Symmetry: D2
Subunit: 373 residues, 4 copies
């Protein structure tokens, strides 16, 4: 559902700043709600915050996109830190969409197909039906690879992701810098046009006309050149806006899925820390229960009942933690899936990069050789 979020509209512009109302333009192919012709919904940045928090509460250990930068920032006045917000926002929701469990979620579509305001929804909020997977499900192969190799597998990814996140950030930064470079270049290029026009006009005043005529030939060649520079600068700017504005998402989506897996491994490490403590209790109880086999020799109902309660609560504990451990690792793999899709995504990124650079260079070469005449 490649949906677009453009024409963000707060209450009308002034000194102040308000939290814009974003038109969620449901360009729809997913049949959760049957694919509409189009059905816009007005929703806010606060609405998308509610959205993400609810996603986080319902679906743990699943891919989750970033947020747009904060609205309670120091000074978020001008339109830049709102345009970035809308482009990011589009990327964020649409990323939610390509992801499987979210595209199938109930919460998302209700967030999509709704015409009233947030409060009426709050009446039927009722996310109590939408919470943690407490159900035991039988893995076909209860031992596929979840610790034989996958443990070290994503243990290595845990660090490689921060490394590669810095890397890819620097890379798309470099592309943005190339773009601002070329925009400065077209600036001074039009300045150059101004100069060559003034120079054409001050060639006769400096080079006699009524005596020599070739000057007219040459300061008409310079008119050829001012027109060349006009066209060259225009197509520079065209490359800037079209090419780079539509190239940047092709890069940024990788960054966002990367830091989404960052968030994921953070949540995972700090919650599977519970299984860490539980395995430490595993060894602790192994030890205390092997020392327990003194036969319980003294006739003591107190010791009997106390350590019976101990072992029984610990037994239901170990079974529930094993249930939870497998139920976690499975979702880890479910996320590894679309991460291996991001794999091919980097391919798409670099190939589009080279292609559009080639288009730009081709037009520029054609312009140059055209000028040489």
């Amino acid at each position: 559902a490649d949906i677009i979020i453009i024409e963000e509209i707060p209450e009308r512009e002034g000194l102040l700043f308000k939290h814009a109302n974003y038109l969620v333009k449901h360009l729809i192919a997913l049949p959760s709600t049957s694919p509409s012709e189009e059905r816009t919904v007005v929703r806010r940045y606060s609405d998308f915050l509610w959205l993400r928090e609810i996603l986080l509460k319902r679906y743990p250990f699943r891919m989750i996109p970033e947020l747009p930068p904060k609205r309670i920032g120091s000074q978020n006045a001008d339109q830049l830190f709102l345009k970035k917000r809308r482009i990011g926002l589009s990327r964020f929701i649409n990323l939610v969409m390509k992801h499987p469990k979210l595209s199938n979620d109930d919460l998302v579509l209700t967030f999509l197909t709704v015409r009233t305001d947030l409060t009426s929804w709050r009446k039927q909020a009722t996310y109590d039906t939408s919470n943690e997977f407490a159900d035991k499900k039988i893995s076909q192969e209860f031992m596929k690879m979840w610790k034989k190799e996958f443990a070290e597998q994503w243990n290595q990814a845990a660090s490689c992701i921060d490394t590669s996140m810095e890397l890819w950030y620097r890379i798309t930064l470099l592309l943005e810098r190339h773009e601002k470079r070329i925009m400065q270049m077209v600036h001074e290029r039009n300045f150059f046009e101004t100069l060559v026009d003034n120079f054409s006009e001050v060639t006769p005043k400096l080079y006699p006309v009524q005596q020599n005529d070739t000057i007219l030939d040459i300061n008409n060649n310079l008119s050829i050149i001012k027109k060349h520079l006009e066209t060259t600068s225009s197509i520079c700017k065209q490359e800037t806006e079209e090419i780079s504005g539509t190239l940047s998402p092709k890069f940024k989506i990788f960054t966002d899925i990367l830091l989404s897996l960052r968030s994921l491994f953070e949540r995972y490490k700090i919650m599977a820390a519970n299984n860490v403590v539980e395995l430490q209790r595993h060894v602790e109880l192994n030890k205390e229960k092997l020392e327990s086999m003194k036969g319980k020799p003294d006739v003591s109902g107190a010791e009997y009942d106390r350590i019976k309660k101990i072992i029984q609560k610990d037994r239901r504990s170990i079974i529930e933690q094993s249930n939870r451990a497998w139920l976690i690792r499975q979702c880890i793999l479910e996320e590894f899936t679309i991460f291996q899709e991001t794999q091919f995504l980097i391919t798409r990124a670099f190939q589009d990069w080279a292609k559009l650079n080639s288009n730009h260079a081709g037009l520029k070469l054609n312009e140059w050789e055209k000028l040489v005449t």
Copy 2:
């Protein structure tokens, strides 16, 4: 005589700074001294100062190139303000050479063909033989155009030259700026290569290999891209050094002949100010001598002899100033000649500009399309 001045050598480098000894490499076609195979002479920046001052003293109202910036500047320590000095110096002397009267001058060739030091020359300095043209020469048409149109003609050039000097300076400045731009670009391009190499290396650590192999395909594509960027940056730098270093003189020579005509019109205005005062005396004496025709009625030998001395000295004065006025205007025209050569020089400048930009763009397009594969 396209002579080159490279390998400027002061006493050896240290904290201090000395006035380098410039190897004047007489790549010679002018037969003043018969065209040598090559004959280097060691000469200093001070030597070229002596040169220019002597030229100025001997030949007034003739094209004269600039000097290199000052050696008694505030801080002229590092090699930049000496390399600019040597390139400028080459331009300055070689410009002296293409100019007719200088190429025919005696002073210049002696400055060229000499093997001793400056002092022995100072012994035979003897520039008393080389001074102002005091001789009357008969203009064929004593009225060609020297005031009917040429007066206003170069009166207009007097201002157009400062205008066009600023213009052309800005233009060649813009080219230098384009060059420094592209050098910064190749800087960050090699940084980009570093990044993509690190990214290739952290793709497997983040994208499983023993499971998925396509990652090897893609991070070998990125090796293709790092090699592309290596070649692209190398040829960027090649364009920088070769193209722009050998393009800049093609521009700067126009600037130097322009400010040479600037110097010329300065000297001319401030010395023909003498003819200005002389024409004011012309009208003053016209008036006083028409009032003089009272017949000199009183019998007075004092008044007779005094106003006779007046009229006779004023008569030799008016004839000598007319001699000088025509003898000046003629040299004005002699300079207008090579200025009308600079006319075609701007043509050469812009055409070479476009051509070498086209070469660069062509190589870059070939690199891009080669990469797309």
Copy 3:
């Protein structure tokens, strides 16, 4: 235990980069290990990583300082991104120390008092004794304020902390910028000294001495001024290094405790999400068990035993989750404590700021008025 970590030493410097060995200089007042005279221990950045991870595993919902930026960064070659690492590292450990539970922890002191390498420690790692607080402890007032006002209380802090984190970051950024400003200023100030010396030396060459002597008075006044500028620039640089280098931590510590509470509320929200799901199960089971009171009318041992297992496991569940909920909120308050210490810390920050600015301005005023003479 205001301990210092200076003279970070990797294997010797070269092209490469290694993970320095940090001398933990136990300037000790805490008697966990009795206050030593001093006892340095060599430990690495990797060692401090092991440290922090272990802290995180053992003590949840407690103040925890940041890490230094990553060692697997893109290009961390030069010494800047290692000096920042050592200053940060000192701040990080020493912050661990002022915090109560950490200062009392067993893990930390062993990390401190140890002379062998990390591996021998790994033999006696034995952090199984050091894990999650599973014990029930009786809050004196089991209802102090943990939801009547404290819920909204830190709910508001949840957002105010990101706001104030941006703010305080900008503020200490501004101070660093002021410092770099003044360093650039002392740069051009010494350039100014160079200029005025050259100007003194070229005053006589331009202002006749053998005629006029007052020039000696004035170019000795300028010697007074060059000496003034020498002293002024020196004390500028002194203010830079001393004042700002020792002022910056006074600011940064607030930023680090702020983002420590950031990390805390992150962990807390995403783990108390478990209590969120548990309270949703609370309402769900309230509902299903009120619907359950059909008397269990049909004679069915299956339904009887199944819903008996349901209610019993849910009952032990609700008691364990209430135990955990209170056991969490208590640690929340324990952290609120030192946060209310950071309160006065901002006071210390601003007062030291103003004071050292005043010292600098005072010295500068004294220098100026001293110069006026």
Copy 4:
């Protein structure tokens, strides 16, 4: 006659640019025209160009101020390159005024006391009465010092002036840079005020009020600090505008008299080049006339009359050139006078510099120590 030229007015502002009409505000103490109460005259930049050219034509080898930068520049659109023009213009005319011969000139006062337009003046232009000093005047000591020491004296100044011109230019540049520095500083200072206000407002939201009250004390201290920064930034800006705007001329006047003596030595070298050629003819005729003393032995009226004409015209030539040589050197000295006034001018410059820096530092110290409370 410290006259001021403010409220430059072209035809009203638009896209275009016109040559403003400058109100010459005759704050008059010189009685050439008796000191008026005040008498404004409207005059243009073109009018001042006519002025300077006329001065140059009438008075050679006398101090002459610069022009304002060119009006036919490439792009002189915005008001900066007109405000600099008006400040420069004021400096230029007022410098003309402090100079003796100009203050006594007839041309200047007519340029001052005039109410019609430039054309009516052009009717009575009549500068034929105002031209070169052709009169012989008897130097009391015909040998004061004009070559015994003054020759080398200003020969040395010829180069020292370009050196010191670069120096003093760099110096006043450095002051302008200090000013722009402090303006950027007050910019970020007011940004800092914005930050500390937002920080005060987000201290309670982050630091509990209903529990802890000291936060009110501290975020009222920060109100003290925001007011401090308000006042500090305001007085920073006051120092900027008042101090530096009124300090800069105190520096620039030295630069302008310096490059005025630059122009002077240029004119002098290139016109006394005539006396150079005349002294070369002096030695040439000494030689040819000593060789002439063959007695004129052959009976030849042709040779007799020809070399008699030679010697007689050369004799009147040598007497007229000696007249001119002394008449030049005298004006050289007349200019050396006010140059030795510029001597004390540099004193005034540096002393005012130090004083106003001291005022600024004093106010800033008072503000700081006031804040410490």
